[PDB]
């Protein structure tokens, strides 16, 4: 993955990250 390394992605997706 790697989306969780992006603050915005991880912030909106607490389920994915």
UniProtKB/Swiss-Prot annotation:
GO MF annotation: an example: toxin activity
Organism: Conus anemone (Anemone cone)
Subcellular location field: Secreted
GO CC, alphabetical: extracellular region; host cell postsynaptic membrane
Record note on domains: The cysteine framework is I (CC-C-C). Alpha4/7 pattern.
UniProt keyword DNA-binding present: no
Residue numbers bearing the Cysteine amide modification: 17
InterPro entries xrefs: Conotoxin_a-typ_CS
Superkingdom: Eukaryota
Region listing for Ser-Xaa-Pro motif, crucial for potent interaction with nAChR, in residue ranges: 5-7
Expression sites (tissue/organ): Expressed by the venom duct.
Taxon lineage: Eukaryota, Metazoa, Spiralia, Lophotrochozoa, Mollusca
PTM annotation (Sulfotyrosine): residues: 16
Maturation and modification: C-terminal amidation, in synergy with sulfation, is important for activity and structure stability. Non-amidated conotoxins has a 1.9-fold lower inhibitory potency on alpha-3-beta-2/CHRNA3-CHRNB2 nAChRs (IC(50)=0.54 nM), and a 4.8-fold lower inhibitory potency on alpha-7/CHRNA7 nAChRs (IC(50)=367 nM), when compared to sulfated conotoxin.
Bridged cysteine pairs (disulfide): 3-9, 4-17
Name of this protein: Alpha-conotoxin AnIB
Family recorded in the similarity comment: Belongs to the conotoxin A superfamily.
């Amino acid at each position: 993955g790697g989306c969780c390394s992006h603050p915005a992605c991880a912030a909106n997706n607490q389920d994915y990250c």
